[PDB]
Backbone:
């Protein structure tokens, strides 16, 4: 039964949530994932940006990718998306752990760890602004008059599915373009 | 003595080191023109590693080769901080910059607002210019060692930056998707 996924909701909101929850289950999402995510609207879109629901600790990342734990935690701080600053706290999205684990390779090439950590810090800040600009841009395109939660979920998955393949190549090209025009 | 007009107003140790640097840059295919235009010319031989092959195109060439509409192309070039604003047949655009800017169109084709699309470029470019600054200082710090000649630095930056480039692209992509995941869950 869905009802506990629906909770306190009533009226039109509960009816729209029912049809959304129904579509997500067919999408292969669990009751378990829907409870932990409010609103459940973006569950069939987050996997397109690499959130599969898996979480890891800094120590797991360290051992699994063979990187220095302390350096890793500096990078996690510099990105600044999860707090719990405990090496055994399982609070990092898998893809975030793996991304943070790349930083050490720059260090092994002789780059200064302080400076690497600083770059990550400035990049994260610049990208967090672009992210928010990106969010608004996408919403404008998805959000149409009188749309239900399910309409929005379907429209978001379609649009983000088409955008994601382009975003990676683009950001990469934009970085190298800035690096071509240093001085 | 053609090299002489490429040393500028330098003197002493620094003039003779600039001479050795210039002789090597020329061996790399950097033209006297490229050297004169770029001052200090120290990382002219690292430039190709970040996508500058010294080939240039016009906006018309960009619009036709890469598929983009010429009006959008100009807007994106403004947002990025490049050639203030030119003539369609003027061959003043780095080829890789034209490819980069032309990707704007595909986003518009998916039904994204052209104004918002240009806005995102503007905001992204702002963030990345700062990142690029700090990246340069990082790389420079790693190669600079006392007793380093200008040529030593040039060659050391080639060796080092050549190893860094393949890591950078995936790096920045991951750092974008990391922000998108955080914003989505937030
Ligand atoms: C987790 C992210 C770690 C960030 C690591 C820091 C990045 C290293 C910096 C890149 C150095 C390459 C810069 C090359 C300058 C090119 C200038 C030119 O000659 O045109
Ligand atoms: C001039 C060309 C610049 C192109 C910039 C790309 C524009 C990207 C627009 C949005 C893509 C971001 C996708 C994630 C947005 C959040 C979606 C959601 O949570 O509903
Ligand atoms: Cl000089």
Residues:
């Amino acid at each position: 039964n869905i009802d506990d996924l629906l909770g306190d909701l009533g009226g039109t909101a509960r009816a729209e949530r029912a049809k959304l929850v129904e579509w997500l289950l067919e999408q292969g999402i669990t009751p378990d994932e829907i409870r932990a995510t409010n609103p459940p609207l973006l569950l069939a879109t987050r996997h397109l940006v690499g959130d599969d629901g898996t979480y890891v600790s800094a120590r797991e990342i360290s051992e699994n990718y063979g990187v220095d734990l302390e350096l890793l935690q500096r990078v996690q701080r510099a990105v600044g998306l999860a707090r719990v600053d405990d090496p055994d706290a399982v609070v990092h999205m898998r893809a975030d752990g793996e991304a943070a684990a790349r930083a050490q390779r720059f260090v092994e090439l002789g780059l200064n760890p302080d400076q690497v950590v600083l770059v990550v810090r400035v990049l994260a800040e610049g990208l967090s602004h672009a992210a928010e600009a990106m969010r608004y841009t996408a919403l404008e395109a998805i959000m149409r008059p009188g749309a239900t939660e399910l309409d929005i979920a379907k429209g978001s998955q379609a649009l983000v599915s088409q955008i994601v393949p382009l975003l990676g190549p683009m950001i990469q090209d934009m970085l190298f373009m800035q690096l071509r025009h240093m001085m």
The pocket of oleic acid (ligand 1) is lined by residues A 75, 102-103, 106, 111, 116, 119-120, 179-180, 182; B 43, 46-47, 50, 135-136, 138-139, 161, 164, 168, 171 (CB under 6 Å). The first helix of chain A runs from residue 3 to 6.
